[PDB]
Each structure stands twice: as structure tokens, then as C-alpha cells.
Tab-separated table of C-alpha atoms (C1' of nucleotides) in Angstrom:
chain	number	residue	atom	x	y	z
A	12	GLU	CA	16.996	40.586	34.469
A	13	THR	CA	18.253	42.697	37.245
A	14	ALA	CA	17.632	39.903	39.603
A	15	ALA	CA	20.103	39.571	42.638
A	16	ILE	CA	23.036	37.104	42.040
A	17	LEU	CA	23.008	34.190	44.949
A	18	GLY	CA	26.777	33.171	43.845
A	19	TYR	CA	28.873	31.983	41.375
A	20	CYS	CA	29.022	28.305	40.498
A	21	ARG	CA	32.306	27.329	38.047
A	22	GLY	CA	31.620	30.985	36.579
A	23	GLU	CA	27.901	30.753	36.233
A	24	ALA	CA	25.694	33.035	38.040
A	25	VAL	CA	23.044	31.133	39.870
A	26	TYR	CA	19.682	32.815	40.326
A	27	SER	CA	16.489	32.486	42.531
A	28	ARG	CA	14.114	29.675	41.404
A	29	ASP	CA	10.995	32.127	41.732
A	30	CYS	CA	12.080	34.261	38.615
A	31	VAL	CA	10.926	31.824	35.767
A	32	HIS	CA	8.376	33.370	33.693
A	33	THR	CA	6.357	32.294	30.422
A	34	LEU	CA	4.643	33.511	27.436
A	35	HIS	CA	2.540	32.586	24.665
A	36	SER	CA	2.303	32.199	20.771
A	37	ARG	CA	0.302	34.276	18.293
A	38	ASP	CA	-1.876	30.896	18.220
A	39	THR	CA	-2.148	30.593	21.696
A	40	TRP	CA	-3.415	34.312	21.953
A	41	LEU	CA	-5.924	33.586	19.144
A	42	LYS	CA	-7.379	30.551	21.276
A	43	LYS	CA	-7.687	33.191	24.100
A	44	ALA	CA	-9.717	35.558	21.742
A	45	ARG	CA	-6.785	37.851	21.250
A	46	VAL	CA	-5.058	39.133	18.294
A	47	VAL	CA	-1.728	40.176	18.049
A	48	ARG	CA	-1.096	43.797	16.697
A	49	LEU	CA	0.182	44.071	13.250
A	50	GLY	CA	3.782	44.784	12.902
A	51	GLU	CA	4.610	44.144	16.683
A	52	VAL	CA	8.187	42.405	17.158
A	53	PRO	CA	7.598	39.378	19.038
A	54	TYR	CA	9.067	39.710	22.555
A	55	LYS	CA	10.939	36.371	22.895
A	56	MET	CA	12.284	34.069	20.255
A	57	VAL	CA	12.809	30.362	21.199
A	58	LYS	CA	13.145	27.165	19.239
A	59	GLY	CA	9.769	25.752	18.666
A	60	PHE	CA	8.536	22.174	18.822
A	61	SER	CA	6.024	22.567	15.966
A	62	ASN	CA	6.103	19.657	13.327
A	63	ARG	CA	6.702	22.120	10.601
A	64	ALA	CA	9.696	23.507	12.431
A	65	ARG	CA	10.859	19.992	13.468
A	66	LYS	CA	10.842	19.038	9.807
A	67	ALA	CA	12.710	21.957	8.629
B	27	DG	C1'	30.965	13.118	33.235
B	28	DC	C1'	29.654	9.961	29.062
B	29	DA	C1'	26.801	6.609	26.485
B	30	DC	C1'	22.589	3.554	26.232
B	31	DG	C1'	17.747	2.259	26.586
B	32	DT	C1'	13.353	4.147	26.717
B	33	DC	C1'	8.612	7.594	26.053
B	34	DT	C1'	6.743	10.620	23.382
B	35	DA	C1'	5.448	13.851	19.351
B	36	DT	C1'	1.563	22.367	17.987
B	37	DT	C1'	-1.148	20.165	9.756
B	38	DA	C1'	0.790	16.203	4.201
B	39	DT	C1'	0.196	11.864	0.798
B	40	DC	C1'	-2.420	8.187	-1.447
B	41	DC	C1'	-6.500	4.584	-3.273
B	42	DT	C1'	-11.137	5.510	-5.530
B	43	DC	C1'	-15.820	8.529	-8.402
B	44	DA	C1'	-18.084	10.873	-13.145
B	45	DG	C1'	-21.129	10.991	-20.183
B	46	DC	C1'	-20.157	9.972	-25.033
B	47	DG	C1'	-18.002	7.141	-28.944
B	48	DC	C1'	-15.708	2.839	-30.503
B	49	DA	C1'	-15.742	-1.987	-30.185
B	50	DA	C1'	-18.097	-6.358	-28.572
B	51	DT	C1'	-22.258	-9.287	-28.459
B	52	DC	C1'	-26.565	-11.372	-29.553
B	53	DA	C1'	-30.966	-12.217	-32.964
B	54	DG	C1'	-32.468	-13.048	-37.128
B	55	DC	C1'	-31.689	-14.997	-41.710
B	56	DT	C1'	-29.251	-18.108	-44.798
B	57	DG	C1'	-25.742	-21.678	-46.986
B	58	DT	C1'	-23.937	-26.563	-47.310
B	59	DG	C1'	-23.714	-31.057	-46.436
B	60	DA	C1'	-26.184	-35.353	-44.947
B	61	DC	C1'	-30.287	-37.806	-42.548
B	62	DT	C1'	-34.948	-39.286	-42.772
B	63	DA	C1'	-39.650	-40.204	-43.374
B	64	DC	C1'	-44.046	-40.506	-46.248
B	65	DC	C1'	-46.784	-40.411	-50.903
B	66	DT	C1'	-47.095	-41.139	-55.976
DNA sequence: GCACGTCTATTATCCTCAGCGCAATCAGCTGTGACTACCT
């Protein structure tokens, strides 16, 4: 989050492209033979694309 | 910058199987009338 700001376009800060990182869901970790520890707060919250969420 | 045509999607609902008791079905017997042939 402390990445240097290259500039401002119409008030919006422009960041470097090589700063994008991804994560995985609990089901994805399960496929990777890993189990999420109980009580852990999820690190990132994003709008999911699952059919159950899509119907909701 | 805005609206239209197009490509694609991280778990739900609906037509068909399984032992007993009641009703449907046939076999056998009889009635009712006539038809018909042989013998006394």
C-alpha cells in the first residue's frame, strides 16, 4: 500500500503495473491440500462470481 | 463519453420404481325357448 505514486490523473493516483497480487479462497486452499485455520479473519473481501452468490 | 451487439457462466428441480386388498374376469353349470332327427 506504500507504493510510490507516479502521478495524478484527474485526481486519481497512478501506480506501477508490477504491483498487482492475487489470493485464493478457502475452497482453492482445500484443493491445494491446505485448510484455513479456524477463526481467521479473511484477508481480502471481493465480490464473488459463484452461482449461489450470483442468484443472491 | 454513451449505448448496442455479442460471448460466456465456481451446486437445484422434475419424470419414474415398490406388497396387499378390492374389484374385474373367466369356467362351469343351468334355464328358456325353438329346431331337428329317429323309433314305437
